[PDB]
Enzyme design. Structure first.
Site, short mmCIF file in Angstrom:
data_model
loop_
_atom_site.label_atom_id
_atom_site.label_comp_id
_atom_site.label_asym_id
_atom_site.label_seq_id
_atom_site.Cartn_x
_atom_site.Cartn_y
_atom_site.Cartn_z
N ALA A 9 0.85 -1.20 0.00
CA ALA A 9 0.00 0.00 0.00
C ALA A 9 0.88 1.26 0.00
N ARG A 14 9.93 6.33 -5.55
CA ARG A 14 11.28 6.18 -6.14
C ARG A 14 11.25 5.38 -7.52
N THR A 84 5.02 1.20 7.59
CA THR A 84 4.81 -0.22 7.51
C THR A 84 4.10 -0.78 8.74
N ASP A 109 7.29 -5.93 -2.75
CA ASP A 109 8.44 -5.60 -3.63
C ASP A 109 9.68 -6.53 -3.38
N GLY A 146 17.00 -1.38 6.44
CA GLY A 146 17.17 -1.26 7.90
C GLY A 146 18.42 -2.09 8.35
N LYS A 357 -0.36 -12.96 -40.71
CA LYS A 357 -1.31 -12.56 -39.69
C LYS A 357 -2.54 -13.48 -39.88
N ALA A 386 7.81 -15.58 -54.55
CA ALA A 386 8.40 -14.43 -53.87
C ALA A 386 7.58 -13.18 -54.13
C1 LIG Z 1 3.90 -19.55 -66.39
C2 LIG Z 1 5.32 -19.92 -66.70
C3 LIG Z 1 5.75 -21.13 -65.89
C4 LIG Z 1 5.65 -20.16 -68.21
O1 LIG Z 1 4.81 -21.17 -68.60
P1 LIG Z 1 5.03 -21.79 -70.09
O2 LIG Z 1 3.91 -22.74 -70.43
O3 LIG Z 1 6.42 -22.34 -70.12
O4 LIG Z 1 4.76 -20.59 -71.09
P2 LIG Z 1 3.35 -20.83 -71.85
O5 LIG Z 1 3.71 -20.93 -73.26
O6 LIG Z 1 2.46 -22.05 -71.62
O7 LIG Z 1 2.27 -19.83 -71.29
C5 LIG Z 1 0.97 -20.22 -71.67
C6 LIG Z 1 0.40 -18.80 -71.78
O8 LIG Z 1 0.61 -17.85 -70.62
C7 LIG Z 1 1.22 -16.60 -71.08
N1 LIG Z 1 2.14 -16.37 -69.95
C8 LIG Z 1 3.03 -17.24 -69.45
N2 LIG Z 1 3.63 -16.65 -68.34
C9 LIG Z 1 3.01 -15.47 -68.14
C10 LIG Z 1 3.11 -14.50 -67.13
N3 LIG Z 1 3.98 -14.67 -66.08
N4 LIG Z 1 2.34 -13.43 -67.24
C11 LIG Z 1 1.49 -13.28 -68.26
N5 LIG Z 1 1.33 -14.19 -69.20
C12 LIG Z 1 2.10 -15.29 -69.17
C13 LIG Z 1 2.04 -17.08 -72.30
O9 LIG Z 1 2.10 -15.84 -73.03
C14 LIG Z 1 1.06 -18.11 -72.93
O10 LIG Z 1 -0.04 -17.38 -73.48
P3 LIG Z 1 -0.32 -17.36 -75.14
O11 LIG Z 1 -0.42 -18.88 -75.34
O12 LIG Z 1 -1.44 -16.29 -75.34
O13 LIG Z 1 0.90 -16.65 -75.75
C15 LIG Z 1 6.27 -18.77 -66.45
O14 LIG Z 1 6.04 -17.71 -67.46
C16 LIG Z 1 6.06 -18.11 -65.08
O15 LIG Z 1 5.29 -17.14 -65.00
N6 LIG Z 1 6.83 -18.59 -64.08
C17 LIG Z 1 6.77 -18.11 -62.69
C18 LIG Z 1 7.45 -19.11 -61.78
C19 LIG Z 1 7.52 -18.42 -60.40
O16 LIG Z 1 7.14 -17.21 -60.27
N7 LIG Z 1 8.02 -19.09 -59.38
C20 LIG Z 1 8.18 -18.60 -57.98
C21 LIG Z 1 9.65 -18.08 -57.82
S1 LIG Z 1 9.86 -17.49 -56.07
C1 LIG Z 2 10.57 0.84 8.14
C2 LIG Z 2 10.62 -0.41 7.31
O1 LIG Z 2 9.75 -1.26 7.36
N1 LIG Z 2 11.69 -0.53 6.53
C3 LIG Z 2 12.01 -1.78 5.87
C4 LIG Z 2 11.63 -1.71 4.40
O2 LIG Z 2 12.32 -0.62 3.78
P1 LIG Z 2 11.73 0.09 2.47
O3 LIG Z 2 12.28 1.50 2.41
O4 LIG Z 2 11.91 -0.84 1.30
O5 LIG Z 2 10.15 0.18 2.80
P2 LIG Z 2 9.09 0.45 1.63
O6 LIG Z 2 8.89 1.94 1.50
O7 LIG Z 2 9.49 -0.37 0.42
O8 LIG Z 2 7.73 -0.18 2.23
C5 LIG Z 2 7.67 -1.56 2.59
C6 LIG Z 2 6.49 -2.22 1.89
O9 LIG Z 2 5.32 -2.07 2.70
C7 LIG Z 2 4.27 -1.38 2.01
N2 LIG Z 2 3.94 -0.15 2.74
C8 LIG Z 2 4.89 0.72 3.06
C9 LIG Z 2 4.56 1.88 3.75
C10 LIG Z 2 3.23 2.11 4.10
O10 LIG Z 2 2.92 3.15 4.72
N3 LIG Z 2 2.28 1.23 3.76
C11 LIG Z 2 2.60 0.11 3.09
O11 LIG Z 2 1.70 -0.71 2.79
C12 LIG Z 2 4.79 -1.02 0.62
O12 LIG Z 2 3.98 -1.66 -0.37
C13 LIG Z 2 6.21 -1.56 0.55
O13 LIG Z 2 6.29 -2.54 -0.50
O14 LIG Z 2 11.99 -2.93 3.75
C14 LIG Z 2 13.40 -3.13 3.75
C15 LIG Z 2 13.74 -4.36 2.91
O15 LIG Z 2 13.02 -4.31 1.68
C16 LIG Z 2 13.89 -3.30 5.19
O16 LIG Z 2 15.32 -3.43 5.19
C17 LIG Z 2 13.49 -2.10 6.04
O17 LIG Z 2 13.76 -2.39 7.42
N1 LIG Z 3 -3.01 -5.42 -45.50
C1 LIG Z 3 -3.82 -4.27 -44.99
C2 LIG Z 3 -4.43 -4.79 -43.68
O1 LIG Z 3 -3.34 -5.12 -42.77
P1 LIG Z 3 -3.67 -6.14 -41.50
O2 LIG Z 3 -5.17 -6.64 -41.62
O3 LIG Z 3 -2.59 -7.29 -41.51
O4 LIG Z 3 -3.50 -5.37 -40.21
O5 LIG Z 3 -5.35 -3.81 -43.07
C3 LIG Z 3 -4.73 -2.52 -42.65
C4 LIG Z 3 -5.76 -1.53 -41.97
O6 LIG Z 3 -6.28 -2.21 -40.80
C5 LIG Z 3 -3.86 -1.91 -43.83
O7 LIG Z 3 -3.04 -0.88 -43.31
C6 LIG Z 3 -3.08 -2.91 -44.74
O8 LIG Z 3 -2.87 -2.27 -46.05
N1 LIG Z 4 12.57 -18.85 -55.29
C1 LIG Z 4 12.08 -20.26 -55.12
C2 LIG Z 4 13.35 -21.09 -54.90
O1 LIG Z 4 14.00 -20.61 -53.70
P1 LIG Z 4 15.61 -20.98 -53.50
O2 LIG Z 4 16.14 -21.74 -54.79
O3 LIG Z 4 16.37 -19.64 -53.16
O4 LIG Z 4 15.75 -21.89 -52.29
O5 LIG Z 4 13.05 -22.53 -54.82
C3 LIG Z 4 12.20 -22.94 -53.67
C4 LIG Z 4 11.95 -24.50 -53.60
O6 LIG Z 4 13.26 -25.13 -53.47
C5 LIG Z 4 10.89 -22.04 -53.59
O7 LIG Z 4 10.28 -22.22 -52.32
C6 LIG Z 4 11.05 -20.53 -53.97
O8 LIG Z 4 9.73 -20.04 -54.42
MG LIG Z 5 10.83 -1.68 -0.36
#
Ligand SMILES: CC(C)(COP(=O)(O)OP(=O)(O)OC[C@H]1O[C@@H](n2cnc3c(N)ncnc32)[C@H](O)[C@@H]1OP(=O)(O)O)[C@@H](O)C(=O)NCCC(=O)NCCS
Ligand SMILES: CC(=O)N[C@H]1[C@@H](OP(=O)(O)OP(=O)(O)OC[C@H]2O[C@@H](n3ccc(=O)[nH]c3=O)[C@H](O)[C@@H]2O)O[C@H](CO)[C@@H](O)[C@@H]1O
Ligand SMILES: N[C@H]1[C@@H](OP(=O)(O)O)O[C@H](CO)[C@@H](O)[C@@H]1O
Ligand SMILES: N[C@H]1[C@@H](OP(=O)(O)O)O[C@H](CO)[C@@H](O)[C@@H]1O
Ligand SMILES: [Mg+2]
Ligand SMILES: CC(C)(COP(=O)(O)OP(=O)(O)OC[C@H]1O[C@@H](n2cnc3c(N)ncnc32)[C@H](O)[C@@H]1OP(=O)(O)O)[C@@H](O)C(=O)NCCC(=O)NCCS
Ligand SMILES: CC(C)(COP(=O)(O)OP(=O)(O)OC[C@H]1O[C@@H](n2cnc3c(N)ncnc32)[C@H](O)[C@@H]1OP(=O)(O)O)[C@@H](O)C(=O)NCCC(=O)NCCS
Ligand SMILES: CC(=O)N[C@H]1[C@@H](OP(=O)(O)OP(=O)(O)OC[C@H]2O[C@@H](n3ccc(=O)[nH]c3=O)[C@H](O)[C@@H]2O)O[C@H](CO)[C@@H](O)[C@@H]1O
Ligand SMILES: CC(=O)N[C@H]1[C@@H](OP(=O)(O)OP(=O)(O)OC[C@H]2O[C@@H](n3ccc(=O)[nH]c3=O)[C@H](O)[C@@H]2O)O[C@H](CO)[C@@H](O)[C@@H]1O
Ligand SMILES: N[C@H]1[C@@H](OP(=O)(O)O)O[C@H](CO)[C@@H](O)[C@@H]1O
Ligand SMILES: [Mg+2]
Ligand SMILES: [Mg+2]
Ligand SMILES: [Mg+2]
Ligand SMILES: [Mg+2]
Ligand SMILES: [Mg+2]
Lengths: 475, 475, 475
Positions: A9, A14, A84, A109, A146, A357, A386
């Site tokens: 109390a 401090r 106290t 305390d 004390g 989240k 990514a």
């Molecule tokens: C989709 C992907 C795998 C390529 O696929 P693919 O079959 O070898 O290329 P495709 O020839 O089949 O694509 C089929 C269609 O999608 C379109 N397309 C493919 N990738 C696209 C992209 N990223 N955005 C927009 N269009 C895309 C191609 O133009 C094609 O369309 P079309 O037939 O009108 O020309 C590649 O482009 C891709 O986007 N990779 C992403 C992999 C990735 O992000 N990994 C995570 C890394 S952390």
């Molecule tokens: C006079 C006294 O007792 N001093 C002791 C107190 O010093 P210290 O100076 O620590 O005494 P505090 O001021 O801490 O008070 C002791 C405790 O009792 C309670 N409190 C304090 C005063 C009050 O009027 N009402 C109340 O309820 C507080 O919550 C506090 O936690 O503890 C030390 C060790 O920790 C001891 O070495 C001291 O001998």
């Molecule tokens: N992703 C959105 C989301 O974040 P989150 O729901 O993870 O807090 O809502 C927020 C407002 O509350 C925005 O600032 C962020 O743009």
């Molecule tokens: N960027 C890709 C890559 O990461 P990394 O080659 O740097 O480990 O391959 C992974 C699987 O092995 C994936 O999860 C990631 O999307």
């Molecule tokens: Mg004390």
């Protein structure tokens, strides 16, 4: 039979804080909570907390602790902090007039105080038939405590407060822990004779020692060699020192149980955290609240987890996370932010610069880079490319995405919720997904690449880039 | 001539670990590795390691160390851990029956022990013509060690184990380091007379001291004032304490050589790391494995580098990286993740929220923001725009990108490997690059911007955004 | 009246540095700056700094400090480092031949020395009418210091340098702080009689003590119990030790004033930083330069702020930032990088994986994820969607963006500066904004989503994704 009073109390001046002193925390509990857990373990018949002018702010937490600890904890009110000894007289009003058990008094305390120290106190008290037994210890620096006055035969005569001690008394290094056991009659009698002329102008509980010594009663002072157990906290320097010593002990217990902690001084572990065998905790880590870490995990460096459950064999490195769970064998970090409601399955991955989240992510699924996952459920063995965003905010409200299993979505995909991506679907790099994607489909939306030849010589003439493409065009 | 035996066959129970105790690490070596490097530096004629039931797990590492250290290291097997004295009798079986050199015995859990301490041991032993010389030291806390019994003239009489010492012996603070030099005949003779009735029921090597004292042989105890050198490790608390003291010494050596280390307590440097003059290492840093840092670098805070080579004048801040190299004058961080095979040229930059894996990045090139570079080779003086991705995974396999010199690629560019971007080329912001881009070309793919006027009043009516555009439309 | 000389002309060899020793820093000042601030507070009549061969590098900083401290500070030059006593004779040349005030001499490598210690020195000197008063202290480890020779009555006879002390003198633990007050005539007289045969072959200022004792003058040695105040710095180990002790004191002052500092050992606070009441500073934080933190803030863990102003109630967690300001109640981090010229308004947010450079961000505006903001001005209550880029570099120059209030821009928006986004406007996810967007408009640019059904079975046949969409197509 025994009644324990906790004095909580005083004003805490401090601390210099707007938060009541006994509510300041270490190792994931308030000082008051530490003190009440220790007392409840002793299981005394009565437990009374004396509160003062902030009682409205603290009494509700005492009831929460009473509920947790499965017992009644009474609160007595002291209207003004008159000292106290006056605090104890307020406490005793919560006992019946004819109470005849022992009375133990402690402060709110003294947060490392433990049930064993209290039980030894009470056994000592009974064994020597004391009217008062006081706990004491010896410190290199006794400032603020004390001082225990003893004659050459070690009999205690008095306690003298820092503010009232002569230069000669101040050199005494044995100090009062402020933890006492009392015969109740003797206590009431001595209290009724306190005077407040002394430097603090208060009613000092510590005066009862010399009062009972004068009456010819048995006065006993029991010396606690582990000083930290009875260290008190009057300001923020003492509070961080005890936090650090408590932490050292918590860490040491986990090391002896089988946890490698690389650098105990920078590894902060709260009291209810559990850690499995052969986990290694790297420096700069704090494990807070009810975090649970399994066995053979790798945690840190520079990770903070609050209420996070981590299964066995997982790695959680450079991660800041709370209220989440991370499955067995999963890999999280470096530089990952987990917000509440994150659930990552076994063997899942949340990689660098990823924020999650309120999302569930299935077994074996990977969100490896630069991606925000919010309000999403993702299935198993999927890979989110990514730099993607689960766009969960339409400018006014939050919306959900669902992503199936075995999917491979492309880098820089925006899932404009609500949308569903079916099992085994792909999206291309750069896709803005605004409608569902069926199982096994490829969704894309970016336009065709267009190469504009000679753009650099015509729009950046004379630049390093124009000179380099001129060089390549020869070569 | 001298044979050194290392006892490493006990079970390590107090580690509570599934990893054999002598394989636990500090400062980038196992305890066994530390002990064998120190012994090899002394270059004794014979070096024998006694191993026990986990010998299959440790023997291969002893051979690796024998190879590194350029010598033969023999392994003797002790089938059951019958005590340190029985371990020595197992070790001696790896020597010839007629060996006549000195025998030094040490433990595998004394990892700061050094060649100079051993050479002084052996010189002391020879100088006083001892039958046994034991290393001892004095500790504030001797718990766990054998105690050195001496008469008032300092003559050693016996060693008494923690488990077998009386309360009075336990107050002795001079302890047995468990490091000994022996006349071989005297050793064999004493060992053959060990008895196992004692509290641990083992054959104690420490009994040989009182046995040889009884025979009238010269028994000598050499006191090591730097206790850390002969500290042992039986549990994870001792292991982190010695790790921290070793680290302090490693850091201090670099400070005296010309490295500013802001906070030695949070700067962990492994034993083979090298650091150039006037580098400054900020707090929370660990430099691990065979990392090499040049001169005038700035490292940290909160950086972890494992086997990373960093040239002169570079800055590596808040970075988590391994098996990479960073050129002179380069700037890495804050918040950067380098995975194996990263090579960043001189004056290069890898900025915040960038992750690089298995990529080479030329002189003067910058990847300044929010970007993942995987399996890519990039030329010189190029700039990769913010938030880009080298898309190196087609959903089943990894693919490579090549980017020339002096290029300026736009923010939010996805390089869908395999593709090549020629020298001096640009890409626009938002481009998905799926085909090669010639030198000096601009590649783009996003569609034209479309502004839909009044969308906000019509689709978010009554919202704060609709009210603000209504306000602006007047004003 | 008093003249203070600061000796700062020795070579600093044991630093092993290309930066002059007195220019090495702790707690955000050079050692020389610490020493001159302390002396200026005492406000002596004359203040002279003796500099040596690097004087060109240091003299300009002495003038900057003279300007800051509002006084004249003279520089005397010592051409070769012939010893501390020769340094003092160089210093005295900057005084008039007839100066008659006291002369105090201190070193430039005693950076915790404070005005109160100096004033007590000068009062002691005058009170006992000394010809020389020397400050001394006692150390567990006196290595490197001159030893104070006293007779049994405590009268000082001499000081003997580490290099010249016998084994017996070396055990003396009382050491010379190298801080002295002198009667000027006595000083000049003794200095003129120094000899340089001694182990360092220098003219030792410390010889004046035994010289003046021989003349029969009063020689007084004043013992400083707080040793840290007069600790000196000759190498980088001592420098980090004093940095750590200074830091502890700086932190303790803030704790006593009302700041919770969870872990003082990993919380580095520079001397001019200010922190408001009830702020909590989590571990691994450094607050550097002229950072100012308001009240009730939450800072850290693992935050570094250099010259950052943070208003009341703000949170700044896992953030690396400099020359920025963060408004009241704002939330920054975790994992945020603030570069110079960042100004975040009250209740603003800069979230995980966000980098800001030279941008102003209005009240209540949020940039919550994975986004780079450079050279931008953004209004109030706006929201910038995840993974956006303010594209401020056209390949050769930097350009500005302006964004109004109450806007909601979409994830993955690239603002290709220069552009302006009007109040209450939206952009869709994936938009590349290359022209202004009027108030209340929606800007978009991505093409329509196209779903290519059965792509996965046809282009990834036999893969896990193809098998999963085959499973779903039944089910
Ligand atoms: C989709 C992907 C795998 C390529 O696929 P693919 O079959 O070898 O290329 P495709 O020839 O089949 O694509 C089929 C269609 O999608 C379109 N397309 C493919 N990738 C696209 C992209 N990223 N955005 C927009 N269009 C895309 C191609 O133009 C094609 O369309 P079309 O037939 O009108 O020309 C590649 O482009 C891709 O986007 N990779 C992403 C992999 C990735 O992000 N990994 C995570 C890394 S952390
Ligand atoms: C006079 C006294 O007792 N001093 C002791 C107190 O010093 P210290 O100076 O620590 O005494 P505090 O001021 O801490 O008070 C002791 C405790 O009792 C309670 N409190 C304090 C005063 C009050 O009027 N009402 C109340 O309820 C507080 O919550 C506090 O936690 O503890 C030390 C060790 O920790 C001891 O070495 C001291 O001998
Ligand atoms: N992703 C959105 C989301 O974040 P989150 O729901 O993870 O807090 O809502 C927020 C407002 O509350 C925005 O600032 C962020 O743009
Ligand atoms: N960027 C890709 C890559 O990461 P990394 O080659 O740097 O480990 O391959 C992974 C699987 O092995 C994936 O999860 C990631 O999307
Ligand atoms: Mg004390
Ligand atoms: C490309 C860029 C520099 C503008 O170039 P510009 O020549 O000034 O504009 P142009 O008139 O020549 O563009 C030529 C063509 O490309 C189209 N275009 C330009 N930028 C585009 C982009 N980012 N996406 C799609 N198309 C684009 C223009 O529409 C024009 O085509 P058109 O002639 O059919 O209408 C600019 O739009 C850009 O994308 N800058 C990015 C800079 C960057 O990201 N830096 C890294 C920051 S970390
Ligand atoms: C813009 C958005 C809110 C949808 O708006 P909507 O009105 O419900 O959909 P609309 O029917 O009005 O769109 C109007 C036009 O824009 C087109 N469009 C909408 N969103 C688009 C986008 N992101 N890219 C390209 N075009 C888009 C629609 O095709 C429609 O054009 P049309 O009439 O030619 O077919 C939504 O698509 C969006 O992009 N949300 C992003 C939210 C966000 O990123 N928040 C930040 C999270 S951190
Ligand atoms: C009886 C004995 O010697 N005790 C010594 C031992 O205590 P301590 O209790 O440390 O002895 P340990 O249990 O560590 O065993 C000593 C070492 O010998 C090996 N080993 C042990 C037992 C065994 O049966 N086979 C075997 O090979 C182990 O690898 C171990 O590393 O070292 C201490 C210092 O570190 C000394 O103060 C003790 O005097
Ligand atoms: C002989 C002498 O004085 N030794 C003292 C000096 O030791 P210490 O060995 O520290 O002496 P230093 O080499 O540090 O020199 C003292 C200071 O005077 C300046 N300087 C030094 C030499 C020179 O020729 N010119 C010059 O200007 C340097 O800037 C230096 O800062 O300080 C110690 C405490 O810190 C004292 O215990 C020693 O008694
Ligand atoms: N965003 C660009 C900007 O960064 P910033 O102006 O924040 O330094 O200019 C740099 C060159 O100076 C480039 O590397 C970056 O692509
Ligand atoms: Mg597009
Ligand atoms: Mg051992
Ligand atoms: Mg993007
Ligand atoms: Mg010096
Ligand atoms: Mg995009």
């Amino acid at each position: 039979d025994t009644a324990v009073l906790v004095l909580a109390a005083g004003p805490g001046t401090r601390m210099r804080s707007d938060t009541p002193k006994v509510l300041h925390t270490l190792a994931g509990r308030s000082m008051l909570s530490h003190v009440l857990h220790a007392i409840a373990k002793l299981a005394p018949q009565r437990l009374i907390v004396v509160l003062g002018h902030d009682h409205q702010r603290i009494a509700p937490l005492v009831g929460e602790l009473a509920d947790t600890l499965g017992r009644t904890i009474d609160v007595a009110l002291q209207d003004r902090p008159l000292g106290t000894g006056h605090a104890v007289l307020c406490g005793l009003s919560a006992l019946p007039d004819d109470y005849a058990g022992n009375v133990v008094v402690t402060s709110g305390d003294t947060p490392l105080l433990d049930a064993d120290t209290l039980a030894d106190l009470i056994a000592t008290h009974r064994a020597v038939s004391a009217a008062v037994t006081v706990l004491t210890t010896t410190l290199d620096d006794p400032f603020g405590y004390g001082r225990i006055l003893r004659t050459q035969d070690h009999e205690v005569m008095a306690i003298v407060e820092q503010t009232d001690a002569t230069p000669s008394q101040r050199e005494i290094r044995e100090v009062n822990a402020g933890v006492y056991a009392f015969d109740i009659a003797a206590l009431r009698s001595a209290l009724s004779r306190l005077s407040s002329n002394n430097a603090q102008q208060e009613l000092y509980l510590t005066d009862v020692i010399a009062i009972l010594r004068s009456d010819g009663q048995t006065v006993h002072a029991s010396h606690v060699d582990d000083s930290a157990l009875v260290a008190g906290v009057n300001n923020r320097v003492q509070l961080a020192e005890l936090a650090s010593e408590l932490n050292r002990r918590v860490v040491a217990a986990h090391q002896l149980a089988g946890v490698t902690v690389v650098d105990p001084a920078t590894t902060w572990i709260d009291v209810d955290v559990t850690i499995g065998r052969d986990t290694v905790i790297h420096p700069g880590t704090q494990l807070l609240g009810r975090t649970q870490i399994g066995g053979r995990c790798v945690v840190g460096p520079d990770t903070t987890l609050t209420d996070v459950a981590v299964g066995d064999g997982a790695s959680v490195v450079r991660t800041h996370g709370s209220s989440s769970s991370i499955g067995d064998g999963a890999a999280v970090g470096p530089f990952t932010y987990l917000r509440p409601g994150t659930a990552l399955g076994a063997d899942g991955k949340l990689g660098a610069f990823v924020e999650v989240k309120n999302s569930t992510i299935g077994t074996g699924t990977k969100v490896p880079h630069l991606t925000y996952v919010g309000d999403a459920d993702i299935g198993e063995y999927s890979n989110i490319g990514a730099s993607s965003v689960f766009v969960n905010y339409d400018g006014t409200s939050k919306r959900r995405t669902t992503v199936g299993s075995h999917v491979r979505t492309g880098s820089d995909t925006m899932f404009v919720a609500p949308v569903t991506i079916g099992d085994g679907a792909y999206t291309g790099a750069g896709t803005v997904v605004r409608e569902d994607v069926p199982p096994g489909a490829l969704a894309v939306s970016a336009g065709p690449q267009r190469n504009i030849e000679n753009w650099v010589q015509r729009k950046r003439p004379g630049s390093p880039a124009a000179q380099a493409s001129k060089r390549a065009s020869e070569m």
